[PDB]
Amino acid sequence: MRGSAHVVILGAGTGGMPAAYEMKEALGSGHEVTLISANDYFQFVPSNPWVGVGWKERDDIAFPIRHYVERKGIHFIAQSAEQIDAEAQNITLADGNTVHYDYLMIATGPKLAFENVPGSDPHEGPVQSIATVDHAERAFAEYQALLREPGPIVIGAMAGASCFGPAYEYAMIVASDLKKRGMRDKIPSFTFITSEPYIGHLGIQGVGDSKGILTKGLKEEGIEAYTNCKVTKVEDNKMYVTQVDEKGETIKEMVLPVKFGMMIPAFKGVPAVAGVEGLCNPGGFVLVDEHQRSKKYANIFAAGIAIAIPPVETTPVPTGAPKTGYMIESMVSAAVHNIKADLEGRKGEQTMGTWNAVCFADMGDRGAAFIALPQLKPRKVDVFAYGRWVHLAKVAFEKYFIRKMKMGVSEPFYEKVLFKM
Amino acid sequence: MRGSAHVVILGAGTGGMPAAYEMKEALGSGHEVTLISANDYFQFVPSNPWVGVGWKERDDIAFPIRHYVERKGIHFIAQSAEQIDAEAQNITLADGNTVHYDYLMIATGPKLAFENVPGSDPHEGPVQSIATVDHAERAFAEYQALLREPGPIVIGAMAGASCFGPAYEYAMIVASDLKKRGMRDKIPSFTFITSEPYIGHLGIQGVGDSKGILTKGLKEEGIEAYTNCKVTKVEDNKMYVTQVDEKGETIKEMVLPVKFGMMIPAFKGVPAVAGVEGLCNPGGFVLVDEHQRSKKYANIFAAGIAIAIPPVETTPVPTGAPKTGYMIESMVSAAVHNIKADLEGRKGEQTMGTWNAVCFADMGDRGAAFIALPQLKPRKVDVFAYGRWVHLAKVAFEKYFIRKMKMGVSEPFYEKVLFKM
Ligand SMILES: Cc1cc2nc3c(=O)[nH]c(=O)nc-3n(C[C@H](O)[C@H](O)[C@H](O)COP(=O)(O)OP(=O)(O)OC[C@H]3O[C@@H](n4cnc5c(N)ncnc54)[C@H](O)[C@@H]3O)c2cc1C
Ligand SMILES: Cc1cc2nc3c(=O)[nH]c(=O)nc-3n(C[C@H](O)[C@H](O)[C@H](O)COP(=O)(O)OP(=O)(O)OC[C@H]3O[C@@H](n4cnc5c(N)ncnc54)[C@H](O)[C@@H]3O)c2cc1C
Ligand SMILES: CCCCCCCCCCCCO[C@@H]1O[C@H](CO)[C@@H](O[C@H]2O[C@H](CO)[C@@H](O)[C@H](O)[C@H]2O)[C@H](O)[C@H]1O
Ligand SMILES: CCCCCCCCCCCCO[C@@H]1O[C@H](CO)[C@@H](O[C@H]2O[C@H](CO)[C@@H](O)[C@H](O)[C@H]2O)[C@H](O)[C@H]1O
Ligand SMILES: [S]
Ligand SMILES: [S]
């Protein structure tokens, strides 16, 4: 309301959860902060691959949101938004109730676009997903079915994917786990299929020696690797693959039988957001400026996977660049700062800062990680690392991030770089 | 004097130069700041290898100090200190003049301990040095003499060395340059001799895949590599080498003829500092606390290579861990903060922070770099990188650091990490 702006945060995930705390922290007792999300629990996404192979339980990586935000003065609605009216500034919920806002911060993350590939939905065939804890549990179930009836494995990433790391992670740990069970030799063929123009492209034109190291890794595990692929359909438990050359001409087509599979899908914007007229690009990604403000509605901001980021490269098979945790946080932080400024007269000048990608993968006893910035080469930082220390660091971060989500954040979040002082 | 403390900074190098500016900045007009150094010019040390091979000129990496510090209110004495009396707080200069201090900050860097190896002094035989611009010019001169009369090459690092990177750098660029001159095939043998227990140990038990990558690098260039070596003497243009096993037993001895050589010497403390009673360890390194204060004299601080840092490992052939630029700056910064605190009543609580090593090497079109912290494994950061971008970064830093030394620093120096914002 007037003089007491009501701020809604849509989506309680990696960006949304912290955004809620920071927003409330920033605005204080004179403003209403409401968090709205499809699920009543928070889940630590980077842990889902491990759940997918049964190295982690839901209980380790997920928890109920309500108590933790409410004790901080945040209102929590565990309901999916079906409709957003940007003129009337009304959000229509699944149960039909409506919620008005003065400022809206969209943090809805990605829609998993299984529809791009008929048959690829995890409820439709053998190709599974590790994107969400629900999916990863399903993935693990099918993994156990494979153990009882060994057959071909196919892991990888679809056309239009942007999140490649987890596919490599999943493939490696699956291999690892098979060995641990003494089952690796019952698998007729283990194939890796990706839309990347080469192995270790990672949707960022490679980082450090990701190419050489991921190539050798797949080779060590007896995993056959195909690049420049798009899957045309999944049907009769077979994956129909089309492989192109640099100029997009077909050089071959394959039919791969799948007893067990996991392909990272392309991400689009969620429907309630994509459905807002003039808000998004054709992908359903919110078009925003450097301050995280919608280019169409001054009182709508966006952060995380939900926002549009221009491509810098056009690959033979469509691929996207990933939006990762540190950058998402900078986005969240900027948006909170600029909304608070709006509430106080000034235009917020705060930006997301320099584009970057940071990723950590844990193979069990050792991890791989990378840092690349800015987006185009030559970079200021372009580094790939591997070792037991990267594993120790993943462990540390999950433990830290989860605690922070229970305890609340103020907060210039990443002061965990204080390990220098 | 009383109420107007006189602060002397001894040594105008990587730590000393910034320390002078920061000290003056911190203390302002009410205090006298005096910089004292053996040379009247500043030199950018990491560039010396390139001078050693003639890829850089003295004029590119060195400049006269006086004008730049004096315009900032700093007094400059281009004179070497021969003697420090810590009781009377008097410094005796080369020309016999004496300078009193209320606080002394020692930044004298390393004494190059050629005396450990008879014949190894660059004025005594074929084994040269790239530690200083004077030495690197001499190194390059002998390099040209080798070109006129091709013979055996021997590059590497002595027993007790702590600065290994530059030896690898020098060996690589020498190889490179020989190829460019079409001379590489006139060289009878190119040998790399090091006290490291293995290639790419770097006095830090390795970082990332420094081992594999440096091993392959030397191999690519046709350079034969021996580890666990100590040189017993240089004589009749031959290098006498002794190689031990894990338990320090001799496994072989070699006599290597040298037409052209460069071995990084062991570093000790400079004599005027080592000569202060009870100030240093047997190496001549100033024993200080976490606040950079001498354990023996409350009004003496130290930073840079000059300070003592405990070993964490004992190698078959003695070796030391390097003290590098970022950590030196943290040391300088802490000391300035704590002296200013002293001048104002309180004990300064500021410390150097977490131990770390950062190094950059440029091979011409591409560079290698590393970051390791903290000192012992498993580390929080353990990374090795290579690429054209590392070369671009070295170039950038030299240009930046040199400008900063001419313009003055305040300054929480490393805000050049703002490339994130
Ligand atoms: C498997 C996996 C591994 C990853 N690993 C890394 C990594 O190691 N490091 C890293 O930096 N990045 C990682 N990423 C990338 C990225 O950090 C994550 O995808 C991250 O969770 C993105 O955060 P977000 O806030 O944009 O979206 P999300 O975390 O997905 O949050 C979106 C939220 O909005 C909710 N929502 C969606 N629609 C509605 C609606 N209509 N109404 C109400 N609520 C809705 C969702 O339920 C969800 O809670 C990983 C991604 C995946 C998929
Ligand atoms: C060849 C080389 C390459 C290097 N490369 C890197 C790298 O890439 N990155 C990095 O982080 N580190 C690098 N290092 C390590 C380290 O950063 C440098 O050695 C650095 O210069 C150390 O700074 P310092 O202030 O301790 O000593 P110095 O820079 O050596 O300064 C000591 C100063 O004190 C003066 N002095 C000594 N005795 C007296 C006296 N008695 N009276 C008056 N003045 C005196 C000297 O003339 C000199 O000016 C390199 C080192 C070397 C030798
Ligand atoms: C800073 C202190 C460290 C030591 C100082 C200098 C030591 C000399 C370095 C020698 C390296 C030479 O060898 C070089 O190594 C890297 C391997 O990682 C290779 O590079 C490889 O990984 C990089 C990523 O980092 C990729 O960009 C590249 O496509 C790939 O081939 C080069 O093909 C090889 O030429
Ligand atoms: C974070 C996103 C990136 C992708 C996600 C996961 C991809 C899978 C990673 C597969 C790597 C497997 O292969 C592994 O690679 C590194 C090579 O650099 C090797 O490790 C080598 O370099 C490292 C340093 O980084 C040294 O510690 C090691 O002694 C050396 O052998 C391992 O011997 C090899 O087992
Ligand atoms: S991702
Ligand atoms: S060094």
Swiss-Prot record, chains A, B:
Recorded GO CC terms: membrane
Compartment annotation: Membrane
InterPro entries: FAD/NAD-bd_sf, FAD/NAD-binding_dom, NADH-Q_oxidoreductase
Enzyme Commission (EC) number: 1.8.5.4
GO biological process, one term: aerobic electron transport chain
Binding locations of FAD: 11-15, 37-38, 80-81, 305, 325, 394
Catalytic activity: n a quinone + n hydrogen sulfide + n H(+) = polysulfur(n-2) + n a quinol
Primary location: membrane
Positions of the catalytic residues: 163, 359
Keywords of the record: FAD, Flavoprotein, Membrane, Nucleotide-binding, Oxidoreductase, Quinone
Membrane topology field: Peripheral membrane protein
Requisite cofactors: FAD
Pfam families in the cross-refs: Pyr_redox_2
An example molecular function term from Gene Ontology annotations: sulfide:quinone oxidoreductase activity
Disulphide bonds in the chain: none
Quaternary context: Homodimer.
PANTHER family per UniProt: APOPTOSIS-INDUCING FACTOR 1 (PTHR42913), SULFIDE-QUINONE REDUCTASE (PTHR42913:SF6)
Biological function: Catalyzes the oxidation of hydrogen sulfide, with the help of a quinone. Consecutive reaction cycles lead to the accumulation of a polysulfide product on the active site Cys residues; these products are released when they exceed a critical length, typically as cyclooctasulfur.
Family: Belongs to the SQRD family.
Protein name: Sulfide-quinone reductase
Species whose genome carries this gene: Acidithiobacillus ferrooxidans (strain ATCC 23270 / DSM 14882 / CIP 104768 / NCIMB 8455)
Lineage of origin: Bacteria, Pseudomonadati, Pseudomonadota, Acidithiobacillia, Acidithiobacillales
